[PDB]
Ligand binder design. Structure first.
Ligand SMILES: NC(=O)CC[C@H](NC(=O)CCc1ccc(-c2cc(-c3ccccc3)cs2)cc1)C(=O)N[C@@H](CCC(=O)O)C(N)=O
Ligand SMILES: [Ca+2]
Ligand SMILES: [Ca+2]
Ligand SMILES: [Ca+2]
Ligand SMILES: [Zn+2]
Ligand SMILES: [Zn+2]
Length: 159
């Protein structure tokens, strides 16, 4: 198996905020994405406001210091690093997308759920109904549930 966090208690911090949304909408979306994987694992996630966090959430564009430049509106929407120190675990969102709480533009909550799965050590899935499938689709946020493949996936890593 790939790398996994060696603790079940895991912290994160939001480095900066997209102008597209209200700041409280960003905190919510992100807290909720974490909630998703917390609900199917022995993992506990604690947001820190200042200091060292295992997971840094970043909004940035084009070339942003990691070797994996983004690409303007469309195309790559976000990427994340598997578990590890430093940039390990970190999740970056392409500021050139228009981030929303709804079905217009790119939904942030949905993208976060996918990216946090990479931050936890997950690959892509070959199942289209899995959040870990390589492409973005909007699904009704109210009724959103992880797929059985996703759960098998995260549970083979932690538990
Ligand atoms: N070159 C590449 O490899 C780019 C791929 C690029 N992906 C990325 O950048 C990856 C980020 C990511 C991946 C997957 C998802 C989602 C999965 C689900 C889902 C939920 C329930 C059931 C089934 C699915 C909801 S959302 C969300 C975010 C992308 O999707 N791009 C869009 C382009 C959008 C546009 O131009 O507007 C696309 N759809 O192809
Ligand atoms: Ca892009
Ligand atoms: Ca990190
Ligand atoms: Ca934007
Ligand atoms: Zn990056
Ligand atoms: Zn991915």
């Amino acid at each position: 198996m790939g790398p996994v966090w060696r603790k079940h208690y895991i912290t994160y911090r939001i480095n900066n905020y997209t102008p597209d949304m209200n700041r409280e909408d960003v905190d919510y979306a992100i807290r909720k994405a974490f909630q998703v994987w917390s609900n199917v694992t022995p993992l506990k996630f604690s947001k820190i406001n200042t200091g060292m966090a295992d997971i840094l959430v970043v909004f940035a564009r084009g070339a942003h210091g990691d070797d994996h430049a983004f690409d303007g509106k469309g195309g790559i929407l976000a990427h994340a690093f598997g578990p590890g120190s430093g940039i390990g675990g970190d999740a970056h969102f392409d500021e050139d997308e228009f981030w929303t709480t709804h079905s217009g533009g790119t939904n942030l909550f949905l993208t976060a759920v996918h990216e946090i799965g990479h931050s936890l050590g997950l690959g892509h899935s070959s199942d289209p109904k899995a959040v870990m499938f390589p492409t973005y689709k909007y699904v009704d946020i109210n009724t959103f549930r992880l797929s059985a493949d996703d759960i098998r996936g995260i549970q083979s890593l932690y538990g």
